[PDB]
Short mmCIF file of C-alpha atoms and ligand atoms in Angstrom, two decimals:
data_model
loop_
_atom_site.label_atom_id
_atom_site.label_comp_id
_atom_site.label_asym_id
_atom_site.label_seq_id
_atom_site.Cartn_x
_atom_site.Cartn_y
_atom_site.Cartn_z
CA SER A 22 18.76 -24.59 10.64
CA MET A 23 19.16 -21.80 13.29
CA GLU A 24 20.21 -19.24 10.44
CA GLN A 25 16.91 -19.93 8.78
CA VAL A 26 15.13 -19.15 12.14
CA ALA A 27 17.01 -15.87 12.42
CA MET A 28 16.12 -14.76 8.89
CA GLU A 29 12.59 -15.72 9.84
CA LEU A 30 12.74 -13.65 13.08
CA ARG A 31 14.02 -10.87 10.79
CA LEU A 32 11.17 -11.48 8.26
CA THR A 33 8.86 -11.66 11.34
CA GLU A 34 10.16 -8.47 12.80
CA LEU A 35 9.96 -6.57 9.36
CA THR A 36 6.44 -7.96 9.30
CA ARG A 37 5.52 -6.38 12.65
CA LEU A 38 6.98 -3.02 11.48
CA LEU A 39 5.03 -3.30 8.07
CA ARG A 40 1.78 -4.03 10.04
CA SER A 41 2.13 -0.79 12.01
CA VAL A 42 3.14 1.14 8.91
CA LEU A 43 0.05 -0.41 7.23
CA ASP A 44 -2.23 0.52 10.06
CA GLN A 45 -0.90 4.11 10.13
CA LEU A 46 -1.32 4.38 6.29
CA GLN A 47 -4.84 3.09 6.43
CA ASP A 48 -5.76 5.65 9.19
CA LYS A 49 -5.12 8.35 6.55
CA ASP A 50 -8.04 6.88 4.52
CA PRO A 51 -11.08 7.54 6.77
CA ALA A 52 -13.30 7.44 3.63
CA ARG A 53 -12.16 3.86 3.08
CA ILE A 54 -11.76 4.45 -0.64
CA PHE A 55 -8.66 2.28 -0.71
CA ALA A 56 -9.76 -0.62 1.71
CA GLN A 57 -10.93 -3.18 -0.90
CA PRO A 58 -10.25 -3.94 -4.54
CA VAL A 59 -12.00 -1.95 -7.10
CA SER A 60 -15.06 -4.08 -8.04
CA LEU A 61 -15.09 -5.40 -11.68
CA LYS A 62 -18.77 -5.71 -11.49
CA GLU A 63 -19.04 -1.89 -10.75
CA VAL A 64 -16.15 -1.01 -13.22
CA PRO A 65 -16.22 -3.76 -15.76
CA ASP A 66 -13.55 -2.05 -17.97
CA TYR A 67 -11.10 -1.62 -15.00
CA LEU A 68 -8.49 -4.16 -16.14
CA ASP A 69 -8.35 -2.47 -19.63
CA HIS A 70 -7.02 0.64 -17.86
CA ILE A 71 -5.21 -0.83 -14.84
CA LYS A 72 -2.88 -3.77 -15.15
CA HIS A 73 -1.98 -4.35 -11.55
CA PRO A 74 -4.92 -3.43 -9.13
CA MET A 75 -3.97 -2.92 -5.63
CA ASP A 76 -5.73 -2.14 -2.28
CA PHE A 77 -5.15 -2.30 1.54
CA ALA A 78 -6.94 -5.66 2.09
CA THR A 79 -4.85 -7.26 -0.61
CA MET A 80 -1.71 -5.74 1.00
CA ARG A 81 -2.79 -7.04 4.29
CA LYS A 82 -3.35 -10.70 3.04
CA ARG A 83 0.17 -10.63 1.55
CA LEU A 84 1.62 -9.17 4.82
CA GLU A 85 0.03 -11.78 7.04
CA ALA A 86 1.44 -14.41 4.81
CA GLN A 87 4.85 -12.65 5.37
CA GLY A 88 5.05 -12.12 1.61
CA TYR A 89 6.92 -8.81 1.91
CA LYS A 90 10.72 -9.58 2.06
CA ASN A 91 11.78 -5.82 2.26
CA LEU A 92 10.30 -2.28 2.53
CA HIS A 93 10.74 -1.75 -1.20
CA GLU A 94 8.17 -4.35 -2.00
CA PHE A 95 5.63 -2.90 0.46
CA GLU A 96 6.16 0.63 -0.93
CA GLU A 97 5.67 -0.67 -4.35
CA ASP A 98 2.27 -1.92 -3.51
CA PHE A 99 1.33 1.30 -1.73
CA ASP A 100 2.44 3.33 -4.79
CA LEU A 101 0.19 1.15 -6.98
CA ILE A 102 -2.83 2.04 -4.86
CA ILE A 103 -2.01 5.67 -5.36
CA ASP A 104 -0.93 5.61 -8.83
CA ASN A 105 -3.80 3.44 -10.12
CA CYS A 106 -6.23 5.89 -8.63
CA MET A 107 -4.57 8.90 -10.19
CA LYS A 108 -4.57 7.24 -13.59
CA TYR A 109 -8.16 5.93 -13.56
CA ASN A 110 -9.80 9.13 -12.07
CA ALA A 111 -9.58 12.67 -13.47
CA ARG A 112 -7.72 15.38 -11.60
CA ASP A 113 -10.89 17.15 -10.37
CA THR A 114 -12.55 14.06 -8.75
CA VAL A 115 -12.76 13.22 -5.13
CA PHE A 116 -10.99 9.86 -5.78
CA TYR A 117 -8.01 11.45 -7.43
CA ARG A 118 -7.72 14.01 -4.65
CA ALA A 119 -7.88 11.37 -1.97
CA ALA A 120 -4.89 9.63 -3.53
CA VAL A 121 -2.75 12.74 -3.56
CA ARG A 122 -3.69 13.34 0.00
CA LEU A 123 -2.93 9.73 1.06
CA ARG A 124 0.45 9.96 -0.87
CA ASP A 125 1.53 13.18 0.92
CA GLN A 126 0.53 11.83 4.36
CA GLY A 127 1.87 8.41 3.70
CA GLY A 128 5.31 9.83 2.75
CA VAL A 129 5.86 11.10 6.27
CA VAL A 130 5.26 7.60 7.72
CA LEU A 131 7.37 5.95 5.03
CA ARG A 132 10.34 8.30 5.43
CA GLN A 133 10.59 7.22 9.15
CA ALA A 134 9.90 3.57 8.28
CA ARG A 135 12.89 3.51 6.02
CA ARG A 136 15.08 4.89 8.97
CA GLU A 137 13.65 2.04 11.32
CA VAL A 138 14.30 -0.76 8.75
CA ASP A 139 17.92 0.45 8.31
CA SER A 140 18.41 1.26 11.91
CA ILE A 141 16.97 -1.99 13.54
CA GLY A 142 18.29 -3.95 10.49
NA1 LIG B 201 -6.36 10.02 -15.82
#
């Protein structure tokens, strides 16, 4: 149907918006701390601590499969990246501090993304 193609243009346009949002969030991570999953070989206990690991490559695979149906789902994954890091790493560590800084800078991008997603539809 034509309706299913419109929905799909909508999902497609949301995806385009989420891709820009993603590339802008990932620019706020020059260290590339959040680019790939935490390695279970280098942190064998990780999954005892963190139940839903997240990282930007994993978010990107999902996005390219158009697996984000709204901004809320995308934000949920971005907050996992931050929140997992702040739980696993202590408050004085470079990792923890990078997540706080990513969060603060990410908020600015996301506050406008929410406006575009309502505004465009
Ligand atoms: Na902690």
